[PDB]
Amino acid sequence: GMDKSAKAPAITIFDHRGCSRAPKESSAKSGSQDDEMLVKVASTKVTVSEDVAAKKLQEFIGFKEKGLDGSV
Amino acid sequence: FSRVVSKAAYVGGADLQALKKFISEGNKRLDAVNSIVSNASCIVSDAVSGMICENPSLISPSGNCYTNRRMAACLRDAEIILRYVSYALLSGDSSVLEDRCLNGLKETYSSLGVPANGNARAVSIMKACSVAFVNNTSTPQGDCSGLASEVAGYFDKVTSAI
Amino acid sequence: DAFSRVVTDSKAAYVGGADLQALKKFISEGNKRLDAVNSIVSNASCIVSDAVSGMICENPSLISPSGNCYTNRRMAACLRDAEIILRYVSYALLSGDSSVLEDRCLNGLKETYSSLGVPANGNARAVSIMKACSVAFVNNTASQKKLSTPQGDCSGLASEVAGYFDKVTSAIS
Amino acid sequence: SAKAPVITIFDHRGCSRAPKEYSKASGQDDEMMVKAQSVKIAVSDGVAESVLKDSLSVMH
Ligand SMILES: *C(=C)C1=C(C)C(=O)N/C1=C\c1[nH]c(/C=C2\N=C(C[C@H]3NC(=O)C(C=C)=C3C)C(C)=C2CCC(=O)O)c(CCC(=O)O)c1C
Numbered sequence: 095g096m097d098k099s100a101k102a103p104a105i106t107i108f109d110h111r112g113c114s115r116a117p118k119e120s121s122a123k124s125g126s127q128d129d130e131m132l133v134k135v136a137s138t139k140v141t142v143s144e145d146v147a148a149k150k151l152q153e154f155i156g157f158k159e160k161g162l163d164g165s166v
Numbered sequence: 167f168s169r170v171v172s173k174a175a176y177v178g179g180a181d182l183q184a185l186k187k188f189i190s191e192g193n194k195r196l197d198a199v200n201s202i203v204s205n206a207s208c209i210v211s212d213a214v215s216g217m218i219c220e221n222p223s224l225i226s227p228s229g230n231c232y233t234n235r236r237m238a239a240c241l242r243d244a245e246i247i248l249r250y251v252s253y254a255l256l257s258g259d260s261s262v263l264e265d266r267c268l269n270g271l272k273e274t275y276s277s278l279g280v281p282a283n284g285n286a287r288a289v290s291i292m293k294a295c296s297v298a299f300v301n302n303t304s305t306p307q308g309d310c311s312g313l314a315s316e317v318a319g320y321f322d323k324v325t326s327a328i
Numbered sequence: 329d330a331f332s333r334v335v336t337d338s339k340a341a342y343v344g345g346a347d348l349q350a351l352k353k354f355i356s357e358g359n360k361r362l363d364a365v366n367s368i369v370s371n372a373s374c375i376v377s378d379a380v381s382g383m384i385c386e387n388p389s390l391i392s393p394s395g396n397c398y399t400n401r402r403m404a405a406c407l408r409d410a411e412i413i414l415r416y417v418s419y420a421l422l423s424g425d426s427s428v429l430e431d432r433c434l435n436g437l438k439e440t441y442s443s444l445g446v447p448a449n450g451n452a453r454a455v456s457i458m459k460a461c462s463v464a465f466v467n468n469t470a471s472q473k474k475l476s477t478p479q480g481d482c483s484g485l486a487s488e489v490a491g492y493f494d495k496v497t498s499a500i501s
Numbered sequence: 502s503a504k505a506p507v508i509t510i511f512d513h514r515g516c517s518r519a520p521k522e523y524s525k526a527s528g529q530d531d532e533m534m535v536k537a538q539s540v541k542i543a544v545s546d547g548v549a550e551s552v553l554k555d556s557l558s559v560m561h
Pocket residue numbers: 106108109110112113114115116117118119120128129130131132134177178179388389391392393557560561
């Protein structure tokens with residue numbers, strides 16, 4: 095059940111082939127380009143700072159404008 | 167990927183090779199997840215803004231997004247939902263999404279007074295966003311419509327649930 | 329002058345009604361100019377975030393241990409500076425001139441960044457991206473059902489805001 | 502002091518929320534406003550971490 099915790103899965107995809115920063119977080123070599131790519135997954139509490147919410151209210155309250163995408 | 171759902175799981179190298187052998191279209195699946203999650207902030211804020219401009223009273227003194235506490239909580243919820251959907255796309259099924267996210271959520275909103283119609287619109291916007299990023303409407307060009315319909319279905323499960 | 333005291337305490341300033349009508353009579357293309365400002369300021373968060381992100385994806389070493397955006401403190405300061413710059417550009421566009429932009433934001437900024445070791449080329453890319461975003465939003469060529477404004481021609485305003493961004497890049501590099 | 506102008510554009514033609522914060526114009530200019538304020542610009546650590554997480558996942 096939903097446990098009112100706020101926690102959600104935070105996924106990071108690193109397609110970092112050719113990256114000069116060396117892999118060191120995963121521990122199972124395959125000798126292919128898969129060794130330079132990684133999926134990271136954590137369970138983190140999602141929080142939105144009331145400062146952010148205030149700035150978002152400032153962007154939203156015009157009630158007219160938008161991004162490029164989207165119907166009106 | 168189940169010990170997470172508090173050490174992070176790191177899946178690369180041979181573990182990633184096997185992961186991609188154990189799921190449908192592993193490479194495309196990870197590109198689709200990458201394109202949603204890397205745009206999650208814009209998706210969350212665009213969906214909440216659209217819900218609000220369509221119904222401005224949500225930030226009037228009588229609306230459920232009025233005050234920073236409520237606006238922040240709402241943005242948080244939209245992000246939580248988007249992240250659980252993204253995990254459902256990563257894992258190729260909706261079990262964690264339905265059980266740990268949706269099971270019991272609608273009654274909670276009913277207790278709090280979170281309006282069903284606004285949530286419906288917000289979710290619909292996040293769906294349109296994710297489908298547009300998966301179908302790209304950085305990667306090799308091709309056809310990702312299957313994964314797009316899959317994530318569409320996970321959003322549709324959210325919509326049905328709440 | 330009602331806006332002078334603003335962009336120099338805490339209490340705001342509110343321009344509506346007859347004052348708004350006359351303000352639009354005193355500045356070039358008042359309705360269009362207000363639309364352009366609204367489209368920049370309502371997307372400010374995505375513009376700043378996307379510009380810093382593009383600066384970083386072109387040169388990842390900026391968030392390497394030795395990069396100038398490394399750690400939350402430095403990253404936050406970089407996003408903050410980008411937002412400051414975009415806001416001053418938006419005020420220059422609202423006013424129709426660069427006086428406040430040059431005097432209270434660009435003055436000494438190059439020497440400050442030189443002393444902090446803030447890299448000129450990364451700053452240039454970030455601002456350039458913010459410029460491209462702002463021009464795209466002013467020249468917005470979206471369908472009417474997906475446009476927030478009456479369809480017309482705003483290439484002049486886009487050129488003007490591009491000039492303000494050019495003043496930024498010329499001053500801080 | 503890290504302050505910047507914040508501009509809020511209210512095209513509220515047809516809006517039921519009565520004006521109050523602002524001479525009238527005898528026209529639709531009575532339902533629209535431009536607001537400007539000098540506001541300390543600040544960015545939380547969470548936005549920085551989100552921009553970081555998003556930047557790492559699109560670079561190659
Ligand atoms: C290439 C791109 C990079 C250049 C050039 C550069 O200067 N830095 C580059 C990348 C970079 N990576 C990190 C940190 C992380 N990278 C990963 C992902 C990879 N680790 C792996 O083992 C594999 C494959 C098996 C990867 C792909 C992870 C997990 C981290 C840690 C941070 C996180 O969010 O979990 C940085 C940040 C600074 C540092 O630690 O060097 C940078 C700049």
